Amino acid sequence: MSISISYSTTYSGWTVADYLADWSAYFGDVNHRPGQVVDGSNTGGFNPGPFDGSQYALKSTASDAAFIAGGDLHYTLFSNPSHTLWGKLDSIALGDTLTGGASSGGYALDSQEVSFSNLGLDSPIAQGRDGTVHKVVYGLMSGDSSALQGQIDALLKAVDPSLSINSTFDQLAAAGVAHATPAA
Template sequence: MSVTVTYSTTFGDYESFGWEDDQGIYEEATVGGTFEEQNGFLPAFNDIFSIADHSANPGAFAGTEDPDPIVDLGIWDAFGTFSGTQYAASAEYAGVDLGFIVEAADGSYLNYTFFASPTHTIYGEIGSITFGVGLQQDSNGLYYFDEELVTIDGLDTIGLNGGVDGNGDVIDRTTGLNDTHNIVNGLKDGDASALWAVLDAAGYYEAYEGAALTEVLGVSETTETELELAA
């Protein structure tokens, strides 16, 4: 498995919003503690990401739609686009318009079942998640940020189920077992605990704290400066 976390050079410029440059995406205040006991970007996200009215600001899909979704939306497809290679949302916190972009893994798509069974469930293999400020769309309709803050890549390498069970059926959101729904819907609701849980289970924190464990776990941390030097 290989998860790479890339920070922008301005990542640490937002300390007033709850995270510090040297804490990364999370830094355990208590080893083995719960998400509520963490410091860093993801816990701060929980504090400042909020959408007052999801019907007015539901987020949106972008990119190529899935030509062969597992769940056929039927007539519900007439009500909008519920599939793509991206899903993005931006919150309404005063002082920083923090948002996120979820990218599907190569060859995969992100889908929402709407009223088709299982209802209101997100599925599809996640490749990366980028957090930033100033959510925009390019001429092709794809989302990007005026200022990226942090990107978590390689989420498709750590054994997430993509919201699909062993029979190839979409896992109902109500079971609590759909990794994709738990992560994406959680972020939309201002709750990064599901994302933290899968990273923690994959050993990301240990790799962040001790470089000696990076090679063993196959998890790496990269800064933008290091990437520029390696180019």
């Protein structure tokens, strides 16, 4: 099935590209890199975990921004190809105020702003950190939404060539690929 987007009415007049560039600036870069992951501050977590789940979620260290990647996700940790997030990425949910986790049976955003679902992304372990799933999620972890933007743009054009990341959320809803949720 086609990409589906859920958005708070707050962003009715925003474009997707604008929202993704903005959220990524707010979330910033958690600096989850070689030599820089030494404690719990920038790891994120899996549900149920510890290294696999229906969700991977991460809160910013520069704001209350957070994201939840949904699907059937796996982290290789030390194992060849090391430090690869792979599997099925069905959704990316973006917003503020991450809640829950494995001990609650699920992550949720208290202020979920925009979600992209039916992404249909499936990256095998053999692609390693060159896999699209890895690049999309690691991009969000590291202050660069470009990979996600590229995938959303391709998915939108597959369903309706008039839509792109420069379309407004209300434009996407008019076209039948998005739906607004109450802001207040």
